[PDB]
Amino acid sequence: YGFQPTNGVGYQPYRVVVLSFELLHAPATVCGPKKSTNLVKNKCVNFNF
Amino acid sequence: GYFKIYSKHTPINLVRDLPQGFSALEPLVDLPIGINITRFQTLLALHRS
Ligand SMILES: *[C@@H]1O[C@H](CO)[C@@H](O)[C@H](O)[C@H]1NC(C)=O
Numbered sequence: 001y002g003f004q005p006t007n008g009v010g011y012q013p014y015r016v017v018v019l020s021f022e023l024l025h026a027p028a029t030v031c032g033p034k035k036s037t038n039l040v041k042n043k044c045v046n047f048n049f
Numbered sequence: 050g051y052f053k054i055y056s057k058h059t060p061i062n063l064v065r066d067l068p069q070g071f072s073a074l075e076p077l078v079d080l081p082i083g084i085n086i087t088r089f090q091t092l093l094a095l096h097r098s
Binding site: 026027029 | 050051081083
C-alpha cells in the first residue's frame with residue numbers, strides 16, 4: 001500500500017471488521033443482555049421470572 | 050446436545066460389595082456441547098517410581 005498522511009479520502013487506511021453468526025444449527029450461547037426491573041410485593045401483578 | 054453429570058459421595062464401611070441403602074444423586078453440572086459420543090475410557094494414576 002501507499003499509505004501516506006498527505007493522502008486524502010480513498011487512500012488513507014481504514015480499519016474494517018465483519019461479524020458473522022450462525023442460524024439455528026447448534027445450541028445458542030452468544031445472546032444479547034437480559035433486562036431487569038424492580039421487584040414489588042403484595043400487589044396483583046404479572047411476572048416473567 | 051447437553052452433557053449431564055450427576056454426582057454423589059458417601060462414606061462406606063462395608064468391605065467389597067455395594068451397600069444396601071438408598072441415596073439420590075443431585076445434579077452436578079450441565080454442558081451445552083454437541084458431540085455424538087459412543088465410547089469412553091478411564092484414566093489411572095499409577096505410581097511411577
Ligand atoms: C451423530 O452422528 C452423525 C453421523 O454422521 C453426525 O452427523 C451427527 O452430527 C452426530 N450428532 C452429534 C450431536 O454430534
